[PDB]
Design a protein around this nucleic acid. Structure first.
Lengths: 174, 245
RNA sequence: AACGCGACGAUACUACCCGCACGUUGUAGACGUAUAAGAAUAGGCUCCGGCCUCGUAUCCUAGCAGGCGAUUCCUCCGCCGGCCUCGAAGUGGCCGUCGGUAAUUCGCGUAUUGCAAUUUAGACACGCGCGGGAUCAAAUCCUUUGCAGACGACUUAGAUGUG
RNA sequence: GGGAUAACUGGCUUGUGGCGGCCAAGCGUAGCGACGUCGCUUCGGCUCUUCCUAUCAUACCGAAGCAGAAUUCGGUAAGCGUUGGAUUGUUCACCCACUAAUAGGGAAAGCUGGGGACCGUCGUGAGACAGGUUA
RNA sequence: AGCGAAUGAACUUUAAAUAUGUAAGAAGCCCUUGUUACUUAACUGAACGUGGGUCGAAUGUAUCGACACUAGUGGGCCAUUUUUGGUAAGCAGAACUGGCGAUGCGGGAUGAACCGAACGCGGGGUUAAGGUGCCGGAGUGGACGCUCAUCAGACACCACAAAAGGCGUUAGUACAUCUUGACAGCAGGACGGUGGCCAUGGAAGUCGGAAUCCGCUAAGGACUGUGUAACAACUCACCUGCCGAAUGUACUAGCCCUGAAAAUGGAUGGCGCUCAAGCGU
RNA sequence: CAUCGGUUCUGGCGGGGGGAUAAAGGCCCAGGGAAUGUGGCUCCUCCGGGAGUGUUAUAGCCCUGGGUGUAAUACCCUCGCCGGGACCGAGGACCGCGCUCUGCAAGGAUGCUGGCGUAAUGGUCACCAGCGACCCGUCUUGAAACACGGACCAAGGAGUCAA
């Protein structure tokens, strides 16, 4: 959702006399900005571990940029969302150019198909399918077909919304 | 998604076999192979094969296998490496369609004599060419269809009228008797089931069976066999003109 | 439909029609108020060559608010007639006469509205004036009738007659 | 005699009982647990206009040993109708017929028959008063 | 959290969220020796005195306190959170805080209890809540999907309402079958002991009771339906050939239909809106 | 209209800094690999095109490291410079802070010009138009609602005096 970037967030518990040099945990977080990125770090850590914001410290926040934002890739996202019944696992595939593009599409798709919100979705794994034959979903499988070429029937032309009256009836062929 | 036909769960005693029967079929053939001296491959192309049971009784010292062609082919081994005995892979070349195996301890010429003198009359089955024209006489239809003389025949059962009419016979019940036209036999002409030299379909074949009219012949055609002693497969009359695997 | 519409008859004055002369007259609002195929949108148009996202197109578009005289041009515009065509709440075409007319190129004129002030300019309707043609009407009150009626309203009859 | 209180209901209502056991997908990690099955059983009359359908009849359909006739159960349907007497013996108030049938409700309504509350006095194991006042 | 620390909400090294009482200076703390009628065994304590040492957290401060006098006030309604008890469901009672009472203005079509925001007379700029298809100022704005309802939906999400009915549609989970040929189909087999035993006028797989085995097998039930007076005959289960690549079952999550409605004609505010002018981001 | 001051809306341009001293990318260097397998080869082939083999050839692609390289660009933050509008001009000798000093944009608008000099601006009424807008008082109540008073006008009409 929004515009997202991958964030490498490393945080630690505040060093005490008994426990110097703490564990230095790490996560990858999709957030619109660095303020949200740190909040998700402590929200996730408060669940998993017993480290809180008061006794915590953010070591580094870094942006992970996609290595090849010009290569078309197939992504597989393993996510968990909770509904009125419970928490469910689902695996879905997105054909995109960057991981942030894939995750943004997932948030839109989960909202459209299951009315799931950002607070309800946990992103467990996003992976680049290194090769075809790793694509399981038929909608992605048809896009990776050999010699793909399709027409675009019934294309509605773009007429300025301030051009109320047209002299000729438009055509929907090109 | 939705809008699918409902699969009926049959309240039945016998289920589908699947993998267990296949493995059982492999074991039965593989243990049979060492026990016999010859392995015959025979063909029953478009036959009803209800007489194969009588063949088993006559050949009680032999073993006949009539299963899936692919299962029987690889049970014998289709390549020299997975083959069980020498020359078996070239026997599997004969296994193409509806065929069977005949393990015997007999003289090979004895088997040819038995299966060449064996001949039984059976029903047609679709695809066969009609050797004669069959016509039901116009009038009171009998339980044979103008083959046994009517004086020696009995009228057809009245519960067969919907079944006969479904296959296309314009019959009617007149006072409890199925009739073609009128009981006197003057209202209409007869019914021609099959004509001379014409391929007959299941509609015509079914009509022949209820009238107990046999138009085809049951005969087993031997394609070739394999000698355990010599490990060499020979070629019999039928096989030279028949597609191979 | 008592604030929807059509056809027809007769309309005295007033001014009914025609022409032009204006209005210190009204307008939910001129300023180039320009532009007709039908049909489909998983198809269509054609000149039969080809063409189609796209009306950011086509037409018209110069001149003292648009003068005068030429040079040069048969192009465009307008009024009248004749023949026809237009009815869904009715018009355009063809021909002829006359008038105007940069497609090219000049000569004379513009000043002073003073450095901007709506560039008062169109169409319809209405009214006032002349000069040409044309016409000489009805309704109501009243008396009467009863096919009508609380009263109005209504069907009638009153001019010479089958009153 | 004192205290809290004007009073109730408004997506209300309708056709299938309660209790106990067995089974029971799940939730959960013992407890809740539906459908089935077993066990025990003020009132009446008078009305006109319109609306509703939860249809008694008339129209059309589906099914039933529905032979015919007559029906029964169900569906779409409110277009069209839904009576005259008794109420003079008994009761859970309801017989006589005629008719195609003699369905049920809402607008909730007016006529007509049936069938007061405070003090005062004298007493209270209990009432009496032509004693006073009043909306 | 652990019990690779001991012991076993009632265990603990440590320790949540959450409100909440008290205290934070020279109007202060301790020491000291003079007296005293108090006290002690005692110049010993206590009180009354003497002297000593950056004014001891942050933030704000539109002044604080004492005394006297004077007028209007003595109610409550609703909501959040916590909490006590109860009902079939309602509901009744406490504590705090907030809104209304003395309040105008913007929005929710309208309005005691909702959201925004508080007020001298004017000009300019920018916003909040709420909105930008037309009433109506501002988008027939952009991206990806979902949905077709015989009175959809447009923020009521409580009740009807369930472990509910849908051969509507989309996404997903688990299990299972498949070139050893899966699902669907077509062409054929579906046999023998055996009309198994009892019963029946009759009863042979198919009016009934009970057993339900073996052979041949590729497979075929002492039989799933039609049928006969009883047979016969057909059909199903199951098997094979042809065909050829993906299927089946059960659940979950969205949106859609039903999940009960009476009676003057009317309501997402109205027109109306379907790759929306509906739903999610 | 020109030059200013205050406030504000809205365009463009020139630099600086920071990430992985962006990530990518173009051109080179050295490795490795694969297919939705380019050529080549084989078999089917109906103009057409399929199936198979194998690693760049008569296309290319992926991954790793290095060079150009302190590359460019996006995003974030920053220093300035020009442009186009709108509203406003409070004060009235000097004084002050200042600067780019014959002076100035520095403690608040001046300069130049035009038409008109009268209903022209302006004001009062009545009306049309767009948006807005419950009928007052009393009483009760937490509040509404009910209830009570109100046909209209003129004059009179109610916290005074004494102790």
């Amino acid at each position: 959702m929004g515009r997202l970037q991958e964030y490498q967030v490393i945080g630690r518990h505040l060093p005490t006399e008994a426990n110097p040099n703490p564990a230095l945990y790490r996560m990858r977080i999709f957030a619109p900005n660095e303020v949200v990125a740190k909040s998700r770090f402590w929200y996730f850590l408060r669940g998993l571990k017993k480290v809180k914001k008061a006794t915590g410290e953010i070591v580094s926040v870094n942006v992970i940029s996609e290595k090849h934002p010009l290569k078309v890739k197939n992504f597989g996202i393993w996510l968990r969302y909770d509904s009125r019944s419970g928490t469910h696992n689902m695996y879905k595939e997105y054909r995109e150019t960057s991981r942030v593009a894939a995750v943004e599409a997932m948030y839109a798709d989960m909202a459209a198909r299951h009315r799931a919100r950002f607070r309800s979705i946990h992103i467990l794994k996003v992976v680049e399918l290194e090769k075809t034959e790793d694509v399981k979903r038929p909608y992605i499988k048809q896009l990776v077909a050999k010699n793909l070429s399709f027409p675009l029937p019934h294309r509605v032309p773009k007429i300025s919304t301030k051009k109320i009256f047209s002299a000729k009836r438009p055509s929907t062929f090109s | 998604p939705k809008s699918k036909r409902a699969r009926v769960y049959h309240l039945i005693q016998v289920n589908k076999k699947g993998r267990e029967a296949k493995e059982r079929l492999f074991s039965n053939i593989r243990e049979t192979i060492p026990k016999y001296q010859h392995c015959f491959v025979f063909s029953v192309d478009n036959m009803r094969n209800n007489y194969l049971k009588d063949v088993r009784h006559e050949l009680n010292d032999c073993r006949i296998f009539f299963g899936k062609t692919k299962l029987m082919a690889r049970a014998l081994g289709t390549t020299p490496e997975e083959e069980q005995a020498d020359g078996l892979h070239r026997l599997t070349r004969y296994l193409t369609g509806t065929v069977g195996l005949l393990f015997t301890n007999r003289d090979p010429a004895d088997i040819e004599s038995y299966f060449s003198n064996l001949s039984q009359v059976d029903f047609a089955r679709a695809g066969t060419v009609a050797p004669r024209t069959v016509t039901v006489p116009t009038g009171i239809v009998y339980s044979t269809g103008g083959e046994v003389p009517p004086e020696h025949d009995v009228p057809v059962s009245h519960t067969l009228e919907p079944e006969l009419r479904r296959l296309g016979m314009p019959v009617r019940m007149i006072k409890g008797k199925v009739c073609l036209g009128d009981e006197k036999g003057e209202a209409s002409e007869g019914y021609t089931i099959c004509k001379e030299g014409e391929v007959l379909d299941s509609r015509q074949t079914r009509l022949l069976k209820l009238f107990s009219i046999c138009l085809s012949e049951f005969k087993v055609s031997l394609l070739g066999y394999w000698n355990s002693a010599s490990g060499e497969v020979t070629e019999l009359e039928a096989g030279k003109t028949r597609p191979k695997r």
